[PDB]
Structures are given as structure tokens and as C-alpha cells.
Amino acid sequence: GIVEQACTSIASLYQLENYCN
Amino acid sequence: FVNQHLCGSHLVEALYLVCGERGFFYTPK
């Protein structure tokens, strides 16, 4: 998931927004 | 806080900033 992918790859705004409530 | 590698607590801070009043879910796998 994002926790693993965001450390090894550039995290985007869209990726982050997907985890907002 | 965006368009960079976000390891550990750096991801938590980015979600806090991005999501604002909505809050967020932080879920390691």
C-alpha cells in the first residue's frame, strides 16, 4: 500500500488524498 | 510534503497537511 510505496517511490498529491477520510 | 519520498513519520505529516479537517487513515501493510 501507500506506506510501502511512498517510501520507495515519489508520492503524489493524488496518492495522499486517497487516504483522507 | 508532496512529490517526494515519504518514509516513516514523513508520510504521516504529509497526510495531516493534505487532509486537513477530514483526517486520514494511516495503514502499514
Author numbering:
A (entry chain A): 1 to 21
B (entry chain B): 1 to 29
Q: What did the publication describing this PDB structure actually write?
A:
Insulin is a two-chain polypeptide, comprising an A chain of 21 residues that includes two α helices (residues A1 to A8 and A12 to A18, respectively), and a B chain of 30 residues that includes a single α helix (residues B9 to B19). Integral to insulin’s structure are its three disulfide bonds — one intra-chain (CysA6-CysA11) and two inter-chain (CysA7-CysB7 and CysA20-CysB19). Insulin binding to the insulin receptor is currently understood to involve the hormone forming a high-affinity cross-link between two distinct sites (1 and 2) on the receptor surface.
The X-ray crystal structures of the cis- and trans isomers were determined using diffraction data to 2.70 Å and 1.55 Å resolution, respectively, with the crystals being grown under similar conditions. Residues A1-A9 exhibit a classical α-helical geometry, with the azimuthal positioning of residues A1-A5 being closely similar to that of native insulins within Class 1. Unlike in the structure of the cis isomer, the respective A-chain N-terminal helices of the two trans isomers are involved in crystal contacts, suggesting their crystallographic order may be brought about by these contacts: in solution, the trans isomer A chain is likely disordered. In receptor phosphorylation assays, the cis isomer was equipotent to insulin in activation of IR-B and IR-A, but slightly poorer than insulin in activation of IGF-1R, whereas the trans isomer was ~1000 fold less potent than insulin in activating IR-B. The crystal structure of the trans isomer indicates that it has a Class 1 conformation, and its inactivity suggests that it is incapable of transitioning to a Class 2 structure.
